[PDB]
Each structure stands twice: as C-alpha cells, then as structure tokens.
Symmetry: D2
Subunit: 126 residues, 4 copies
C-alpha cells in the first residue's frame, strides 16, 4: 500500500493531506487545514506518522496514524492533532480517520484541552 | 522543552516511551507496550510525532502527538495508536495524553475499529 | 422536539426510536444492526437542549444504552453525544463511546469510539 | 445498584448525585466545578448494566447531561461512558464527549473529549 497511501488526499472540510509512505512504515508530508486558527504556505504544516507496511490480506484496511503540531514559519496555534485510521484500497481509495486535537492549556483548563472528530480522505480534488 | 520532552517516560500501565525531541518540532523514538497483542525488542516499536517547539509562556502545556504502527521485526498487530496530549514541565514533569488505537478491519467491522483511552507519562521507573 | 421525536436510522442500519420531552428528556429504544447477537431492542434515555440558539446552530443532545434486556446482556454501555440539525433532511450527527465491563488489567482496552449519523430515511 | 447510588465527586470537584434503579435506570443531578458559569445543578439520566459479570469485571454504565436548567443554557450536552469498580474505594472511571450546538461550518470543532474518575470521597 506504499504506492496507494502516497499522494494528495482531501477530506470533507477541503483540507489537503500530502503524504509519502516509506517502505519502512514512515509517513512524511504536509497538512493544509481548510479550517481552524488563522482561517498557501501559511496554512501548511509538517506531518509525520506510521502505517502498517504488511497489512492482513483478508480485505482488512491498513492501520495508520499521523501527527501535526500546528506550528509553521507563519503561525502557532499551540496545539497538535493526531489522526488514527485505516487506508482502504480499491477503485475509490479512502482513508477513514478519527482525530484528537489537543491544545496547550493551563492545568485549570486541561479538562477542555482536547477536541475529537472524524475525517474521511479521498484523492478527489473537491 | 526539547530537553524536557527528550528522555525515557513510563505510563500508568508500565509502558516505556523513549523519545528524542528535535529543534524543528520532530519526535523520534521507540515505544514498548506493557499490554496488548503478544503480551524486550519483541515489544518495542518505532514512533514518530511532532511537538510545539515554541509554546505559550503563560504556564500553558506544550502540545504534542505521536504515532506507533504496531509492526516491528517480530510482531504485527495490524493496528496503530496515536497519542495526542501536552507536556507539563516543572519538578515532576508529566505528559498527559489521550489516545486512539485503530485496527485494520473489514468494512463490516469498521464500526468497532477504534479504542480510546488516556495515558499519563512521568520519568519515574515504576 | 417535533424534529427529534421519531424513528431514526444510522449508517449501519441501526434503529433509534426516540421521544423528546418538552423539558429536555429523551426516552425510547435502540436496536443495533451490529455487535453482540423485542430481544434485539434496548432501552435508551438521554437529554437534549430544549431551548437551542436561534442562529442556525444545531441542538445538542445525548443518550445512553446499556446493552442488557430480558434476553441478552453484552455487559457494555454506549453513549452518543451529538447535535440535531433541522432542514430539508434532518440529521443527528453523533460521536459515541462504548465501554465494556472489564477487569482492572484489561480496563485500558474497555472503550471503543466511533461516529454515527442518523436520518429518518429507512435503509 | 447500592454501590452506584449516592454522591460522587470527580477530579475537578464536580458533584454527581445518582440513583441506580433496579432495572438499569440512572437518574439524578450533576453540578460541574468548571465550564459555562439549584442554578449550577443539571438533570442527568443514564443506564447501567443491572446484571454484571461475576468474574471481577466492572459494571458498564453511562449518562447524559444537557447543560440547560431554568437559570442557564450552555447549548451543549455531555455523555459519560464508563464502568463502576466496587471495592475498598469504589470508583467510576469514565470517558466523556461534550458536544456544543454549532453551525455546520463549525461542526468539526463541536466535540470535546476527556476522562473523569469519580469516588465518594468529598474533596
């Protein structure tokens, strides 16, 4: 699935996920959020993650995850999102994810530090 | 916080989180889970993530996240966990996280693909 | 309340039959299309915001099912938290937590998380 | 049921007053120590497994609060999903989803997630 995961993906918000899958299980690329703090290189951030480079052959998806820390040369949202999900190959390839967005907070506000949601990615430029 | 995040951390399950924080916001290291599939290099896995390299100075934590794909040279659990959280410095430094563990599944079992939980890390070998 | 009350189906074909009370109560039954196994129906109770914002905001709500009835017991409970969005096709968009009773040693793995979207359109 | 019924406090100093019914109902009131703002108390309803495993497993349960009372409205709802663990110090360990009513454009950011542990020990 190295070839299948590698490429340019869009989620239902119109965010752009540009990723390279390495033979070793590495995910490297850039994430551009259509939404969030400060809503173009201004909106583009480094991501890293991992994927299962030897998935099951029973038609199971390929487990994968990645992180973005919302700091770049222009902007710092003092937060980080992780996406945890699976790649499903085939004619209309998709990545289905759930995510956790954690903000840096004081101890007093730590209860409210984390948003949760779900993003589905496809290769169709929306 | 590069120096503060860098090191060997243990969570409440006795898992071992060995991480290097890079000046650029990179997290690199190894994760050894005390629990899970197959429960020592057998139990040790590659992680990568990101952290906010320029946090707020208002006593806020430092947002960070990382991914493990549960494949190594010995074992493949066809799953991936992401931890999303914040580093809190001081005399008893801690990383507070929530996590998403996604398994590769068939489309029919995808509803049950993802576990959620919370891990707190400190530098105290338990 | 008129909007929320009724028969809803999610993307799995599960059936959510709810009555919204005037003062914020949700009551009814949930039949899951998936998971462990009248005998497939479970009691639900919940709460909703009976006075939502009037700025086109959704209506916040949530409910619980414990997966025990007189025939089956999955020793687990699901809570759905989400919002009702009125319109052409009314929708309830939810995230959910499914916690199983576990030993302390297995409690790290006690809780599944997902997301369900409900519409009144029969599968 | 005897174990679950009573006054619980979480790590934030929030107060959870619950009655466990014989047939799986949770009813009561929740006062949050944190967040938007009798006037600080909110209705809760939920469900619990009234016939848990006897293998030292916890008891699965869940409940909802919609953050509306006669004095305040935060246009939001929290659901807690978790398990009751009996013993020397009984504990309810939970994860929670807090969904706010939003516009469709802000619905990506509608839902906070966290974890609360409750004991009967007064803060």
């Amino acid at each position: 699935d190295q070839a299948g995961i590698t490429g340019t993906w869009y989620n239902q918000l119109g965010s752009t996920f540009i990723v390279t899958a390495g033979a070793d299980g590495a995910l490297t690329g850039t994430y551009e959020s259509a939404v969030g703090a400060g809503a173009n290189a201004e909106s583009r951030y480094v991501l890293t993650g991992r994927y299962d480079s030897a998935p099951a052959t029973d038609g199971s998806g390929t487990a994968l995850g990645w992180t973005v820390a919302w700091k770049n040369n222009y902007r710092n949202a003092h937060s980080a999102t992780t996406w945890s999900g699976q790649y499903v190959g085939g004619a209309e390839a998709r990545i289905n994810t759930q995510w956790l967005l954690t903000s840096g907070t004081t101890e007093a506000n730590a209860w409210a530090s984390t948003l949760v949601g779900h993003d589905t990615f496809t290769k169709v430029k929306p």
